[PDB]
A paper describes a structure:
To corroborate our structural data, we performed an additional computational homology search of our internal database to identify G5 and G12 homologous compounds. The 3D crystal structures of these compounds in complex with GSK-3β were solved.
Glycogen synthase kinase 3 beta (GSK-3β) is a serine-threonine kinase known for its ability to regulate glycogen synthesis and to play a critical role in many intracellular pathways, such as the signaling pathways involving insulin, growth factors, and neurothrophins (Wnt pathway and insulin pathway the most known). The central role of GSK-3β in many intracellular pathways makes this enzyme an exciting and puzzling target for drug discovery. This widespread activity has also led to identifying GSK-3β dysregulation as responsible for the development of many diseases, such as Alzheimer’s disease (AD), bipolar disorder, diabetes, cardiovascular diseases, and cancer. In this work starting from a 19F NMR fragment screening, two fragments able to bind the ATP binding site of GSK-3β were identified and characterized through biophysical assays.
Author numbering: 36 to 385
């Protein structure tokens, strides 16, 4: 059995191609709709097809965003096409994406179940690549707004990480308000919990920090079934936020005061032999004041990632580390001077 569609390439000019695929499995299910796996007939390559209801009213924002993006650490939209079948008279948008086998979520949980933590080298590789993907999208003023381990795809052999699921992503424009019900629990920045609608891209940075801490800890750092419970956990670590910090997150001073707890020394939060650089980075990501958090690009240049810039660094399995230094001017525009740290001497050899 073989499906053949006429699809538009995600990048490049509108030059429709006849695409045929087979072995259609299922995955995903949820909010958006369905995700299938498939095998492209000629090349034999695996792809994921995300199928969602097309609005008719507006054009699909995820698609609009996907087509603008091209980066080694973001899933490639290979094709998109429309279809339906069945008793519906409703259009479905189908996004054909590179299939990447693992996710940070699944990996983390394997190590967690086995009472292990992921080797710090993998923590470095995954986090660096995430920050690059954020640096890139943020440069277009696009915030992901749902950074979490399930959205971080991994090829285990190459150590390559790819940000996915742009269903929540949106261009944040100074002055325009945005819904505060967007991020997934545990990874929500305080300003989101306080219902702020004037938030910036630094919510993604907070979320990234939550992922780092979690890979280090072996479990979510700020858990809770309610916002109340999450804030308690946040306060247990960061300490009680000052009236200044409180005004910084949500201007609209919700209505209350929290228990007055002092800052738990970040060193006492983590397993005893945790690298100090890792801990330092966390504290500079997980800050109350949104403007006080490192930028993605600033994070990449943090000393916690120095090992990745070492010329002799290899994967434990012997392979080379994947591309880490092929920055574009687009990607560096945040702060071009950082190139002198980000691009190590050996990467400039001729
Ligand atoms: C594409 N996203 C909307 S998603 O539904 O969250 N998507 C993450 C999952 C995904 N997407 C892509 N592109 N490749 C492999 C996988 C994947 C599916 C199942 C897995 F166990 C691991 C990875 C499915
Ligand atoms: Cl044509």
């Amino acid at each position: 059995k073989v499906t053949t569609v006429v699809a538009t390439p995600g990048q490049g000019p509108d030059r429709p191609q006849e695409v045929s695929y087979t072995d259609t499995k299922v995955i995903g299910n949820g909010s958006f709709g369905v995700v299938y796996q498939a095998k492209l007939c000629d090349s034999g390559e695996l792809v994921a097809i995300k199928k969602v209801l097309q609005d008719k009213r507006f054009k699909n924002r995820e698609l609009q965003i996907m087509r603008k993006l091209d980066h080694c650490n973001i899933v490639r939209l290979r094709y998109f096409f429309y279809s339906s079948g069945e008793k519906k008279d409703e259009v479905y948008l189908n996004l054909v994406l590179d299939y990447v086998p693992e996710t940070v979520y699944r990996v983390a949980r394997h190590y967690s179940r086995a009472k292990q933590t992921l080797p710090v080298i993998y923590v470095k590789l995954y986090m660096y690549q995430l920050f690059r993907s954020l640096a890139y999208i943020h440069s277009f003023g696009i915030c992901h707004r749902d950074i979490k381990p399930q959205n971080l795809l991994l090829d285990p052999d190459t150590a390559v990480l790819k940000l996915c699921d742009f269903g929540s992503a949106k261009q944040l424009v100074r002055g325009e308000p945005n819904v505060s019900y967007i991020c997934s629990r545990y990874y929500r920045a305080p300003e989101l919990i306080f219902g702020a609608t004037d938030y910036t891209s630094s919510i993604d940075v907070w979320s990234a920090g939550c992922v780092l801490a979690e890979l280090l800890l072996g479990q979510p750092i700020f858990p809770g079934d309610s916002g109340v419970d999450q804030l308690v956990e946040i306060i247990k670590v960061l300490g009680t936020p000052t009236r200044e910090q409180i005004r910084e997150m949500n201007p609209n001073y919700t209505e209350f005061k929290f228990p007055q707890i002092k800052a738990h020394p970040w060193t006492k939060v983590f397993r005893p032999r945790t690298p100090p650089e890792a801990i330092a980075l966390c504290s500079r990501l997980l800050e109350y004041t949104p403007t006080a958090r490192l930028t993605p690009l600033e994070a990449c240049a943090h000393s916690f990632f120095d090992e990745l810039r070492d010329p002799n660094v290899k994967l434990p399995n012997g392979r080379d580390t994947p591309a880490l230094f092929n920055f574009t001017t687009q990607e560096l525009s945040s702060n071009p001077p950082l190139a002198t740290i980000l691009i190590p001497p050996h990467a400039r050899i001729q």
